[PDB]
Amino acid sequence: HSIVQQLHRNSIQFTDGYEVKEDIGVYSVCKRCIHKATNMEFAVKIIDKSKRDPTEEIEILLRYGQHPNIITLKDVYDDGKYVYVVTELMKGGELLDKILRQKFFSEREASAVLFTITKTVEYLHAQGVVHRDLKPSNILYVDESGNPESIRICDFGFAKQLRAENGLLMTPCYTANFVAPEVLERQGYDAACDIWSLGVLLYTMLTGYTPFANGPDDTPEEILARIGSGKFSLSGGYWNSVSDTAKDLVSKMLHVDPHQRLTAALVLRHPWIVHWDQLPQYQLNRQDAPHLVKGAMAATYSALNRN
Ligand SMILES: *[C@@H](c1cccc(C(=O)c2c[nH]c3ncccc23)c1)[C@H](C#N)C(N)=O
Ligand code: NA
């Protein structure tokens, strides 16, 4: 029965030092705001306490915000009814959106982008944290520098830390403590779902289209059907100028069975991430239809989270 501190109705009000502006994103309420003191751009996430408890997420942001590739928390408030998670704004747009519009995008470049991301996911996992919503629309650029250092994993709304039955936070390594079985199980599947979403990312980065969807009109049943089959083509036209190490890595990360699927750690050991200096550099023969992909991607996760 320790104190949280995250439960705080202090004096200063959020809208007392911040000026709200237009909306942002596309299931969590977000808006752009300005610091009424330094006039700097910030992103704020408003949450209804009556509809959800954000304590879990807020803490994850605090203890793991320092990570360069994790959206940084800059401030937070609680007016009693809502909670104002003030983080840094993303002016670089969605990472996938930008990359899919770069005709001269190579594997060596795509391999660097994924390396940076997985490196972040590995750390999170190592500290007993899973995202459980690691879709491409939640991976963005902080600025338009174009470099991987400006990559940010965002929206830890559905994130969950690992802890024993009594409440102690433990890492996937430390086992001495007593943790519920189904919990240790769910924490294993969740960590696999993240890697799978990264497989969806790499897939789209290479080809130019979504693996389990063609457009925003595909029926939920046919998509889930493709997802349940564990079958995906890697010998199409767009798959001609693609190395086998890529095709291989892409099949491993997307392995239908979670157990046989690679973990963040293993992914980083794959020769496609390790021997990146061997990878090709000539532009990838891809499909140019980022808007359609954005529709297909949304249709995919829409069916997934249908339940
Ligand atoms: C909402 C949310 C919260 C905090 C910051 C952002 C953000 O910076 C952002 C995401 N997509 C954007 N596109 C253009 C400008 C800024 C963008 C967004 C929600 C959560 N959590 C989310 N989409 O991440
Ligand atoms: Na950060």
From Swiss-Prot:
Residue positions binding ATP: 24-30, 45
UniProt note on tissues of expression: Expressed in many tissues, highest levels in skeletal muscle.
Residue positions, PTM Phosphotyrosine: 123
Positions of modified residues (Phosphoserine): 11, 150
Domain Protein kinase: 18-273
Active site (UniProt): 133 (proton acceptor)
Superkingdom of this protein's organism: Eukaryota
Changes after translation: N-terminal myristoylation results in an activated kinase in the absence of added growth factors.
Location of this chain's protein in the cell: Nucleus; Cytoplasm
Coiled coil: none
Similarity comment: Belongs to the protein kinase superfamily. AGC Ser/Thr protein kinase family. S6 kinase subfamily.
Disease: Coffin-Lowry syndrome: An X-linked disorder characterized by intellectual disability associated with facial and digital dysmorphisms, progressive skeletal malformations, growth retardation, hearing deficit and paroxysmal movement disorders.
Oligomer and partners: Forms a complex with either MAPK1/ERK2 or MAPK3/ERK1 in quiescent cells. Transiently dissociates following mitogenic stimulation. Interacts with NFATC4, ETV1/ER81 and FGFR1.
Protein purpose: Serine/threonine-protein kinase that acts downstream of ERK (MAPK1/ERK2 and MAPK3/ERK1) signaling and mediates mitogenic and stress-induced activation of the transcription factors CREB1, ETV1/ER81 and NR4A1/NUR77, regulates translation through RPS6 and EIF4B phosphorylation, and mediates cellular proliferation, survival, and differentiation by modulating mTOR signaling and repressing pro-apoptotic function of BAD and DAPK1.
Protein name stated in the entry: Ribosomal protein S6 kinase alpha-3
Species this protein is from: Homo sapiens
Gene that encodes it: RPS6KA3
